[PDB]
């Protein structure tokens, strides 16, 4: 039977609770600006932010443009003249203080480190991901951290994965699994790159693009059975 050797983990909403970090950072940003954060505004922020990150994944926008325009795009249509780069800098500081964990992530990663080689694969801002991984105690369990900004490309692009593969000693695709919550960055990314994929989908979101993962789970602890190792 197949035994994976190398696990590539996405960060946000895979092992760290990015939703929680985002929720806190948005609240604090809007309090900082003394602007009421209505349900309608929060919903539009999420749609705008999602569309801009997708444009970046697709190669249609730089990440800097994504993060430096999302808050000006939102506030401008609600009638506020806003400096998108300044708002992002404030948001960024608050986001970098949120290192909430996904349920079971610490115990899972600690257990897997004993039997597999673990790596991080992320499109997130390098400083932000390093800091949140350090603060949550996850950082030392990973052999390396591969950030899109070093590569010239981003998940799901095949060239991002080429960069990662060249930097894993004795890399074998057949013995590698990528685990992440994004159909578009992680699952499409891994599939393109010749990897088995594991979709973290706790909320049983639909698969609108029909990007089919090798596995789909709701909780990280379901990995023990997929990886065929005993939980401890």
Swiss-Prot record:
Active site as annotated: 10 (nucleophile)
Protein name: Putative HAD-hydrolase YfnB
GO BP, one annotated term: pyrimidine ribonucleotide catabolic process
Keywords on record: Hydrolase
NCBIfam families: HAD-SF-IA-v1, YjjG_YfnB
Enzyme Commission number, as recorded: 3.-.-.-
Pfam families: Hydrolase
Annotated family: Belongs to the HAD-like hydrolase superfamily. YjjG family.
InterPro entries: HAD-like_sf, HAD-SF_hydro_IA, HAD-SF_hydro_IA_YjjG/PynA, HAD_sf, PGP-like_dom2, Pyrimidine_5'-ntase_YjjG
EC class name: hydrolase
Gene name as annotated: yfnB
PANTHER family reported in the protein's UniProt record: PTHR47478, PYRIMIDINE 5'-NUCLEOTIDASE YJJG (PTHR47478:SF1)
């Amino acid at each position: 039977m197949k035994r994976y050797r190398t696990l590539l983990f996405d960060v946000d909403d895979t092992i760290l609770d990015f939703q929680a970090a985002e929720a806190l950072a948005l609240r604090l940003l809007f309090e900082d600006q003394n602007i009421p954060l209505t349900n309608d505004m929060k919903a539009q922020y999420k749609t705008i932010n999602q569309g801009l990150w997708r444009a970046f994944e697709e190669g249609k926008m730089t990440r800097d443009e994504v993060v430096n325009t999302r808050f000006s795009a939102l506030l401008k249509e609600y009638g506020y003249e806003a400096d998108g780069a300044l708002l992002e800098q404030k948001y960024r500081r608050f986001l970098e203080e949120g290192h909430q964990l996904i349920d079971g992530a610490f115990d899972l990663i600690s257990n897997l480190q004993q039997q597999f080689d673990l790596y991080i694969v992320t499109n997130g801002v390098s400083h932000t991901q390093y800091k949140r991984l350090r603060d949550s105690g996850l950082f030392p369990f990973f052999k390396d951290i591969f950030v899109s900004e070093d590569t010239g490309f981003q998940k799901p692009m095949k060239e991002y994965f080429n960069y990662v593969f060249e930097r894993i000693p004795q890399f074998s695709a057949e013995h590698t699994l990528i685990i992440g919550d994004s159909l578009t960055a992680d699952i499409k990314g891994g599939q393109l790159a010749g990897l088995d994929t594991c979709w973290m989908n706790p909320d049983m979101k639909p698969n609108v693009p029909e990007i089919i993962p090798t596995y789909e789970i709701r909780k990280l602890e379901e990995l023990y059975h997929i990886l065929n190792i005993e939980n401890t």
